[model samples]
Target: ESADLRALAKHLYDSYIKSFPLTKAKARAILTGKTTDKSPFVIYDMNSLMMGEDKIKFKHITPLQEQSKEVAIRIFQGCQFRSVEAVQEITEYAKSIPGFVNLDLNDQVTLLKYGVHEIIYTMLASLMNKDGVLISEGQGFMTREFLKSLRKPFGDFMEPKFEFAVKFNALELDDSDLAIFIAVIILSGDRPGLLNVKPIEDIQDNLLQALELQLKLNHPESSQLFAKLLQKMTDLRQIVTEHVQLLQVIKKTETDMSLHPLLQEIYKDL
Candidate 1:
């Protein structure tokens, strides 16, 4: 039982601890409260002008569809950070975990494609607290209330992320714990089109062992966390599916609005 599994987790955990962009102190602060930077939140809005005015201008903007179009635009391009950034980070991490990279190249990509969104959603914990999510990767924060103001699918797309973030942060997972956990999600053996299920499952099984060891060592008191992750991961998959469908509304209705090319790719397939 002892020889390789424990050694493997140790090695993967080291790589993960080094690569995360958020230092532990900052992450700790975010978990405790807001960012120490104290800069104003760059609010994303329909008309940057009217959106600033909480009272009058937004009260009666143009056609609700037109306003919603602007709302959607600011969100994906405006409020949303470069999803492309998360894609690369997760992919690179997935590749780093050793077993995932050993799979067929085609299978490697299929795994990423299948679980890309779920991975991104999970990583949001670094940028979010219960009150809001940080915007533009800056000190600027967007409150849940502001997104709720959109009053339809635009805001609806974001609300669940807040819900998830609140629940996720409570787990108090530092980056290393998050690392193995994130690795376990996409390299999952369950993808429908997987070419080599047994190999992939073996790989995830190894990483899942890493996850178990990490949790056991770190969260010894949290007896239910592993099963909790099962439900949470399931919820994330369901949330991302809906998130994709919501983005579809923006793409169809708001022709003039733009998405980052890389972001567009994930949206395209999902």
Candidate 2:
């Protein structure tokens, strides 16, 4: 009775292998004798590249990691204009503003200093923190003092009502490099570059055309403004353009350097 039952069960299981895919896959090599215990064996491998798996398949695996804070800083450093002249020019423009003109000499200097600080702390520092959430002074990323110093004028200007007290992460940056990045953005924004005084929506149609000319060249008004900037901020033109070029090269997938890693990580989920 036991021997007859075993034979009937084997016949049924064999038939099941022909019908079911999972069963078929399981039975195939064993049935065909192609996957014996030693058929796909690797013994005493030197470099230790051996892997154990029931089946083999090829995968085109590529991982894109976020750019690190340090790498982001380097990319920014590469793009810096370091144009004292351009920064001064923007400061001059600010001083001419009706609000700035109303302030006394001390206040005037105060406002420019704060503006410069905001440009450094809020703008550029934020750029560095693009990786993930960060407290201004929590990590060794940036400092609280420089950020606070920059915010003093805003609160002091309105006298009785102390304005917003600016805060920053001191760990990210100290004095010198922080100031340098601040100067770069201030100058870049003021110079003949991508950013415009006019709203982007107002010039959306010509965005592609502007890029093609490599200088936002089509619009007469934007062109004239950019041209004026080019004339006024000569050193800025050279530094910012060079930096922009480097960033473009690094971001290219075909290029050897490729995009910075930490920077890539920050943008992964988003």
Candidate 3:
């Protein structure tokens, strides 16, 4: 039975990788800032925000300080939108795995809630170059320096994300690698509220075993990459902890700017 599960895991992993190939054109576009379409919110021009451009269309056009608050609010909202979309997409993908669909519904929600932020930051790594992430989909980039120049808690809120992104990008993982890694994260049984720990743990182990085999086959020369990537889970958890701390501070000090209810719920247990 163990052998059969391993074979199935390997087959599932292969299909998953095939489903999400790393295209050279896509890679070049993200890394080189050459794009045909612009992202919905925020505009950037080579490491700087484009001045006089309305970052988000819904907001009122006003003074720079007031505009700054709107920009921060819109950015966080954008992140929440992206994160929720990622969760939904990944939920669909999870069903393709051998045993994920059979897990309890509550456990599914718990894993998604706990793991989505980490997966979001991991995808954020792809949009990042050096210390900044491409905003407005390559129209501009936001650096740590530029983010800090914003108003108080908004500036503070973004730094931890960038800090984590820099380290994650350093791993040099492509989309294929990330797809499997994200699967590993989603199948984790260690999330606080899992109702079916035994089944989930079994799936986690099978996925991890498949990942190890795939890494060895995909990257033969680098024996240490797998271990380094595993270590990143801990690193991501620490940075997310810092992110929650800043959110707590913002909730207490800044009363005027309202955080989105979805994001508010995500941070409630943290």
The positional error of residue 56 in candidate 3, measured at the CA in angstroms, is: 5.3
lDDT (10s digit) by residue, model 2, range 108-211: 44333333333322223222221111111111121122222222221111111011111223211222222222323332233222233232222212221222
- Provide the lowest-lDDT 10-residue window in model 3: 39-48
Candidate-wise lDDT, in order: 0.60, 0.27, 0.56
Candidate with best lDDT: 1
Worst 10 residues of 1 by lDDT: 48-57
**CA deviation > 4 Å runs, candidate 1:** 1-14, 17-28, 31-71, 146-151, 221-225, 252-264
TM-score of 3: 0.72
- TM-score for predicted model 1 compared with the true structure: 0.72
Better of 2 and 3 by lDDT: 3
lDDT of 1 by residue, 1-270 (tens): 465445766555565554445422354444444544443344444443244434222444555563354554555444344355656666656777677778878787777777656666666655564555554343344656676565365665556776776666665365656667667776766676776677787888777776766766767666656657645765567767767677776666645454556656755644
- Across 48-84, the per-residue lDDT of candidate 3 in tens digits comes to 3445234433355566563344545655544334455
Residue 256 shift from truth in candidate 2, angstroms = 4.9
Clash counts for all predictions: 0, 25, 3
What is the TM-score of each predicted model, taking all chains together? 0.72, 0.20, 0.72
Arrange candidates by lDDT, descending: 1, 3, 2
